[PDB]
């Protein structure tokens, strides 16, 4: 019933940058405003309580400011571990409400992927389905094109992608693309190719094997 609006909802900044996130309450809430850092698959950690007070053992690079309706969280000098989603939360009145969050990504310089390819195991072909795995290891930025080719035939709608969360020391990503074909389709073809287009690659790179 008090709405918290944060801006931006997404931020991309490099190590050493000053990061500034905004949170606005729909009505005055004095100093009853807290800030949390949530790395994904983990509990929010409290960073600031009462607008401007640092929590125990939270590095001094975090700091908060404001009172009333306009609040800011600042990371004075961004660090690689600081990628997370940051929430503001008012405690002036029930119900406790949270802002929608600001997802902070760490900008690093370009890094090309290493491309590896895994043929479906023998054990899996026992149960009549084939999973071919392409791996794109330790790269930045997140955006990559992964085309699967089977005996030169470009595939469509039979691959799924997954991307790891950002490495906490070097800010790179890894990505897997999995091609799913039936044992029938796998045994009736020879050349299985993963083609990768990325900003750090001068030209597309192709990894393949023969059945």
């Amino acid at each position: 019933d008090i709405q918290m609006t944060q801006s931006p909802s997404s931020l991309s900044a490099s190590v050493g940058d000053r990061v500034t996130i905004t949170c606005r309450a729909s009505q005055s809430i004095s100093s009853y405003l807290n800030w949390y850092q949530q790395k994904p698959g983990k509990a929010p950690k409290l960073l600031i309580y009462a607008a401007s007070s640092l929590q125990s053992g939270v590095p001094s690079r975090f700091s908060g400011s404001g009172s009333g309706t306009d609040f800011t969280l600042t990371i004075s000098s961004l660090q690689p571990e600081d990628f997370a989603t940051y929430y503001c939360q008012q405690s002036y009145s029930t119900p406790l409400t949270f802002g929608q969050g600001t997802k902070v990504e760490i900008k690093r310089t370009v890094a090309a992927p290493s491309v590896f390819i895994f043929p479906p195991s023998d054990e899996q072909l026992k149960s009549g389905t084939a999973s071919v795995v392409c791996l794109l290891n330790n790269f930045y930025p997140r955006e990559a094109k992964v085309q699967w080719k089977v005996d030169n035939a470009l595939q469509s709608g039979n691959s799924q992608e997954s991307v790891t969360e950002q490495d906490s020391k070097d800010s790179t990503y890894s990505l897997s693309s999995t091609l799913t074909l039936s044992k029938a389709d796998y045994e009736k073809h020879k050349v299985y190719a993963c083609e990768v287009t990325h900003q750090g690659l001068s030209s597309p790179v192709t990894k393949s094997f023969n059945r």
């Binding site: 929430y87 405690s91 054990e123 799924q160 890894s174």
Partner: protein, 219 residues
Amino acid sequence: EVQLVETGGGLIQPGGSLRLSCAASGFTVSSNYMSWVRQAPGKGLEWVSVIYSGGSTYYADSVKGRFTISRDNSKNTLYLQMNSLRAEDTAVYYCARYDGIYGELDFWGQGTLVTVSSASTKGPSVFPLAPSSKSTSGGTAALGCLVKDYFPEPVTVSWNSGALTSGVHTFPAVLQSSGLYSLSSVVTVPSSSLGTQTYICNVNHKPSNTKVDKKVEPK
């Protein structure tokens, strides 16, 4: 030092009920403000419930009349009795110590996942991702485990029973067209170690009680 340990999560049929426990260490539950907070998968934080010290209880409008917050002073434990569960209620549930003054959630439990679904529990199939020349990058090679066709979330993967932690990438799970999850766990090791060192992934999927250790070796 303070802890909050959560139990009780898991798969539950729609319309069913489930209870979450939260066992505090290093502070008294009895004399503290206390809270449940939930997060639908890939969404924001949503307040569920507060119990004041002195026992006043308040509830979010979506749970009022369905959910009860309580505590057992003797066991230093907080409870959330949930009822009439729906897909909307699917979330990771967190207990947190409130402040009772500046109303801040200064300490949080690790969370537990509650999946509201009529779909059946299914254990994972575990296939090796064998290292080869197509996996080698000069003194360095990658090998892994494909963990296929399971429900519901989550699975935990380790390498050499938690002994190999360096250079592991365990990928977020994807939801297949079959309504089942799939994921891979790859690790990059030195290629010179490929014939002298043994690599086992230790897949664990608790809702189905499966525990698969799988040996990965060159081909």
